Swiss-Prot record, chain A:
Component of the 26S proteasome, a multiprotein complex involved in the ATP-dependent degradation of ubiquitinated proteins. This complex plays a key role in the maintenance of protein homeostasis by removing misfolded or damaged proteins, which could impair cellular functions, and by removing proteins whose functions are no longer required. Therefore, the proteasome participates in numerous cellular processes, including cell cycle progression, apoptosis, or DNA damage repair. This is 26S proteasome non-ATPase regulatory subunit 13. The chain holds residues 283 to 376 of 376 of the full protein. One of its GO terms (cellular component) is secretory granule lumen. Signal peptide: none annotated.
UniProtKB/Swiss-Prot annotation, chain B:
This is 26S proteasome non-ATPase regulatory subunit 7. There is a cross-link at K50 (Glycyl lysine isopeptide (Lys-Gly) (interchain with G-Cter in ubiquitin)). The modification N6-acetyllysine is found at K74, K84. Component of the 26S proteasome, a multiprotein complex involved in the ATP-dependent degradation of ubiquitinated proteins. This complex plays a key role in the maintenance of protein homeostasis by removing misfolded or damaged proteins, which could impair cellular functions, and by removing proteins whose functions are no longer required. Therefore, the proteasome participates in numerous cellular processes, including cell cycle progression, apoptosis, or DNA damage repair. Does not bind a metal ion. Belongs to the peptidase M67A family. The chain holds residues 131 to 260 of 324 of the full protein. Component of the 19S proteasome regulatory particle complex. The 26S proteasome consists of a 20S core particle (CP) and two 19S regulatory subunits (RP). The regulatory particle is made of a lid composed of 9 subunits including PSMD7, a base containing 6 ATPases and few additional components. Within the complex, PSMD7 interacts with subunit PSMD4 through their respective MPN domain. Interacts with TRIM5. Disulfide bonds: none annotated.
UniProtKB/Swiss-Prot annotation, chain C:
Component of the 26S proteasome, a multiprotein complex involved in the ATP-dependent degradation of ubiquitinated proteins. This complex plays a key role in the maintenance of protein homeostasis by removing misfolded or damaged proteins, which could impair cellular functions, and by removing proteins whose functions are no longer required. Therefore, the proteasome participates in numerous cellular processes, including cell cycle progression, apoptosis, or DNA damage repair. One of its GO terms (biological process) is proteasome-mediated ubiquitin-dependent protein catabolic process. There is a cross-link at K122 (Glycyl lysine isopeptide (Lys-Gly) (interchain with G-Cter in SUMO2)). Keywords: Isopeptide bond, Phosphoprotein, Proteasome, Ubl conjugation. This is 26S proteasome non-ATPase regulatory subunit 8. Belongs to the proteasome subunit S14 family. The lineage of its organism: Eukaryota, Metazoa, Chordata, Craniata, Vertebrata. It comes from Homo sapiens (Human). Residues 1-156 form the PCI domain. Component of the 19S proteasome regulatory particle complex. The 26S proteasome consists of a 20S core particle (CP) and two 19S regulatory subunits (RP). The regulatory particle is made of a lid composed of 9 subunits including PSMD8, a base containing 6 ATPases and few additional components. Interacts with DDI2. Interacts with TASOR. One of its GO terms (cellular component) is proteasome accessory complex.
Length: 94, 130, 175
């Protein structure tokens, strides 16, 4: 459910969500990483667990609609930059 | 754009995750290689539009533009497929679709402070040489 | 100026001249003030009082001597001065407000009272609605939203890409 930009997770949200102590989230994310569903890293001074993903999941109609909207935004950005590049580099293009 | 050949192999399995079975044509990647005699034959056959293999700035820039065009085309095709799936005109695969989700997760997330500093450092390192 | 060599110079012009200079102080047109000062002869810059007063006021304003301006307000020889002196008071208060914006980041009302030469807190509520300075949790006006730290997180990229494109063009032009 993270917005894919602030992928870092704080300790308190994990403790309040899984209703577990703040000393157990560390071992829990360690176990999840060890199994092969997470490829992040663990910090302690700030205790923010860095997050990267290699374990996908099942989608849904609303999720598919939202994610195809995101893909449409991505393709629009790609097209805009391609147009800018061809316009600016018209003479050099050949 | 390219790749006028698509290689397909018949596979037969229970589809693992409990779905009705069918023939299906699993895709296998393809590429265009050449034998030395065929290589000299084709190079002499063109002899009028073959670009310089050294590249130079104009052809590198056109290669970059071609890459942007190809990426836009691929994203457009993927978006059309996703629209077909969402509208119900195509059934949700429920699998491989999450490999496209893996595409979505693999975004580098630029504007990160460390990445920005490293990017500026290398840009200046190239700019001084330029 | 055209007929200086033929017509005399009654004191009145100096008065008006000084007013003119002080006029620019009322309008913050300091550059025009210095040009007009250059127009006048060097002797009259420091000899004539009508020219001396705006020169001294601008010099005090140029070294941050706002207190010197406030105390020298009473050294004017005419009410024609007095009007532009009042306008200069508003202009100098605005200048002090701008300096406060650019220099500091948090400002206290009580010491700002001495800073801006306001004898009534409602005369500062005037700026609190005119300038609309945001009041903090502990009556501390915050200007950290003025300086800020932008452009250090997002790579321009597009502009740099256009610059690199121009480099390639200038390298590949036949000319």
């Amino acid at each position: 459910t993270r917005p894919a930009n602030h992928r870092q997770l704080t300790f308190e949200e994990i403790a309040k969500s899984a209703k577990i102590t703040v000393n157990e989230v560390e071992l829990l994310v360690m176990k999840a990483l060890s199994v092969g569903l997470v490829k992040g890293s663990i910090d302690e001074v700030d205790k923010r667990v860095h997050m990267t993903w290699v374990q996908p999941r099942v989608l849904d109609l609303q999720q598919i609609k939202g994610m195809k909207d995101r893909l449409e935004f991505w393709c629009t950005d790609v097209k805009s930059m391609e147009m800018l590049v061809e316009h600016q580099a018209h003479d050099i293009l050949t | 754009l390219g790749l006028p050949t698509e290689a397909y192999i018949s596979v037969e399995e229970v589809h693992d995750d409990g779905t009705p079975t069918s023939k299906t044509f699993e895709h296998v990647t393809s590429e265009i290689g050449a034998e030395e005699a065929e290589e000299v034959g084709v190079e002499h056959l063109l002899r009028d539009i073959k670009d310089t293999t050294v590249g130079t700035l104009s052809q590198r820039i056109t290669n970059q533009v071609h890459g942007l065009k190809g990426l836009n085309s691929k994203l457009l095709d993927i978006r059309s497929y996703l629209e077909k799936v969402a509208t119900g005109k195509l059934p949700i695969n429920h699998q491989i679709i999450y490999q496209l989700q893996d595409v979505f997760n693999l975004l580098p997330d630029v504007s990160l402070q460390e990445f920005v500093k490293a990017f500026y450092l290398k840009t200046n390192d190239q700019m001084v040489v330029v | 100026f055209d007929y200086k060599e033929q017509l005399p110079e009654s004191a009145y012009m100096h008065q008006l001249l000084g007013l003119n200079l002080l006029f620019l102080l009322s309008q913050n047109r300091v550059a025009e003030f210095h040009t007009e000062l250059e127009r006048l002869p060097a002797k009259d810059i420091q000899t004539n009082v009508y020219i001396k007063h705006p020169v001294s006021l601008e010099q005090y304003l140029m070294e941050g001597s706002y207190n010197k301006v406030f105390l020298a307000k009473g050294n004017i020889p005419a009410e024609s001065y007095t009007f532009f002196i009042d306008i200069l008071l508003d202009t100098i208060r605005d200048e002090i407000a701008g300096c406060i914006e650019k220099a500091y980041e948090k400002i206290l009302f009580t010491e700002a009272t001495r800073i801006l030469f306001f004898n009534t807190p409602k005369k500062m509520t005037d700026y609190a609605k005119k300038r609309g300075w945001v009041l903090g949790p502990n009556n501390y006006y915050s200007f950290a939203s003025q300086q800020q730290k932008p452009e250090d997180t997002t790579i321009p990229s597009t502009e740099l890409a256009k610059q690199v494109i121009e480099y390639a063009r200038q390298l590949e032009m036949i000319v």
